Amino acid sequence: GAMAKKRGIVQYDFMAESQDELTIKSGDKVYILDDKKSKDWWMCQLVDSGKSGLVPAQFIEPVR
C-alpha cells in the first residue's frame, strides 16, 4: 500500500550541488521516497539521519 517502505543501497558517492540534492556515500542505506517524478533522479531518505533529497537514479540499487 501507500505506506510500503522501499529500500535501496547507494552504489556510488554523490556530492550535492543544489539544496534539493542529497549527499551520499557508497554503501549507505536509503528509503526510496519517489522514483517516479523525475527520469534521472530519485528522492531518497538516509536511514541513518532521515536527511532526504534527490540522488542520481542509477546510483541506487533497490533492495528488499
Distance CA 62, CA 6 (A): 7
CA 62/CA 33 separation, integer angstroms: 12
Question: Which residue matches cell numbers 541506487?
Answer: 60
DSSP states of 31-53: EEEESSS-SSEEEEEETTT--EE
CATH number for the domain whose boundaries are 7-63: 2.30.30.40
Domain boundaries, the chain: 7-63
Cα separation of 7 and 60, whole Å? 9
User: What is the spatial distance between Cα 44 and Cα 54, in angstroms, rounded to a whole number?
Assistant: 6
The C-alpha cell of 16 is what? 550535492
- Cβ-in-10-Å burial (0-12, 13-18, 19+) of 44 comes to buried
Residue with cell 527520469: 39
